[PDB]
Ligand binder design. Structure first.
Ligand SMILES: [Cu+2]
Ligand SMILES: [Cu+2]
Ligand SMILES: [Cu+2]
Ligand SMILES: [Cu+2]
Ligand SMILES: [Zn+2]
Ligand SMILES: [Zn+2]
Ligand SMILES: [Zn+2]
Ligand SMILES: [Zn+2]
Lengths: 154, 154, 154, 154
């Protein structure tokens, strides 16, 4: 068995995007990301709790956090669950990244089907800042685009 | 143990729409539907298989059919599973429908999370015709708008 | 700079197994586990201090615990070091998983090269129960097969 | 700053064994060997590069050779590093040796933690022979038994 899902990032900004999530057996997931319309630099890219979209991206809620932890980097132990770091945006405003994460499954409890991915305006602190929002958001603050993770064929 | 979901409809037309689904215990589900920008009359309201959305609405696939059957009406035993009948537009181009189905859960195998709801341009046959697409689409055809069923707080 | 290891588990039982551990630079470690001969359900999976093996599986000492902690779950601050939670066995007695831990390096101090990986008979408590051995073992007690962590190519 | 390691030899044959290795400060290391049910006479006794063991002893690879040299006897300049020479089994087929070498450390680079000790079925040439594999395996080929060098309570 192998699973796949897609997420078409759209906002009220000139930010577009599409991200494909792949998963084998019930091991890790591969996420391929291509987003355009962003300022060159480091962003913030998380798997936000809910799939809403009714109130733009401001209803996809907080970070997906079944383990009840603090905010971190993908390579940390205290991290949310939805932390996926920063994606770098090229000089033309396109961002292409590949992250393989073992906390965003496509099956069972904790599955990330019908949740949302959000690309953030400002670079995420990885929880390293001492901001107030650091321990919760990475101060990546400003949701440019999201979309719900849905099922895609195979 | 109540579970709620949402689906914000938007196609490449001026057909908008927003749907909420609710489920208690592990029972029947209630769909509340409100869609605007539709030609007066009956249309098609189905639960299509995939959340795709990447080549518009034509990526959602066929209707959701776990039981593998023919197309029909909710009140029909032969029915697909994703088949939610027809919704009728007022003279202002609005359809406000309240559907209560037992074939579109939010939990377990057959869960409609991460999938899509599409509003068809023409009326649903219910399989009652003998068109050829009757057994498959209700000859309702032409996806005017769709949405990825995402999780919403409870 | 990337590094791999493998643990070919064998017991005085019918539990066979093989596990690999990969680590790049000086980040986290991916552990791909596959066992057979086990009984449907949850076990215990820990990195025991010694590789020993002379007096079967009982010479592996307790769980690797350099940071001196109590027993817990992988997603626990208070946790041991060698705690790797529970692996699930299917209906044919076969377990496969993919653990991404950050407490079992393959480099420098705390390196787990030459140490043992054990699969236990009972399920681990997560140190949630209040047995006596809850804070020490997770009352998983019963060493079904173990292997010493050995170097393998790349 | 003392250390100890053990390795418990077992092959797909009636050849058993346990070796311990001991190092103090960052000097020499004493190896105590005992193996049973080997055929009377000389064997080969080497430290092989990898600890593998998934395709029996044949995946342990070549002899541990960091200084990149040819094959030889413990007392030889031209020596591999893994080359521990031959051990002699008695008429009841037991073999007990105490090899003291300066080339299989247990700390730092060249460390043989996570490597394998392999007893060959034929007598090792010491590189004197002119076979063709003499400068490689010392023409002792036949991996009767082996094991991963693992840590043991100091
Ligand atoms: Cu975020
Ligand atoms: Cu349809
Ligand atoms: Cu244990
Ligand atoms: Cu050899
Ligand atoms: Zn977070
Ligand atoms: Zn249908
Ligand atoms: Zn423990
Ligand atoms: Zn050699």
């Amino acid at each position: 068995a192998t699973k796949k899902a897609v997420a078409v990032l759209k906002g009220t900004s000139n930010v577009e995007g599409v991200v494909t999530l792949t998963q084998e057996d019930d091991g890790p997931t591969t996420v391929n990301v291509r987003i355009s319309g962003l300022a060159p630099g480091k962003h913030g890219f998380h798997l936000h709790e809910f799939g809403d979209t009714t109130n733009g991206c401001m209803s996809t809620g907080p970070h997906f956090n079944p383990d009840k932890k603090t905010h971190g980097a993908p390579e940390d132990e205290v991290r949310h669950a939805g932390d996926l770091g920063n994606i770098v945006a090229n000089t033309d405003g396109v961002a292409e990244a590949t992250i393989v994460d073992n906390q965003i499954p496509l099956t069972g409890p904790n599955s990330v089907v019908g949740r949302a991915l959000v690309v953030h305006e400002l670079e995420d602190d990885l929880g390293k800042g001492g901001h107030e929002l650091s321990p919760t958001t990475g101060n990546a603050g400003g949701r440019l685009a999201c979309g719900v993770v849905g099922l895609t064929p195979v």
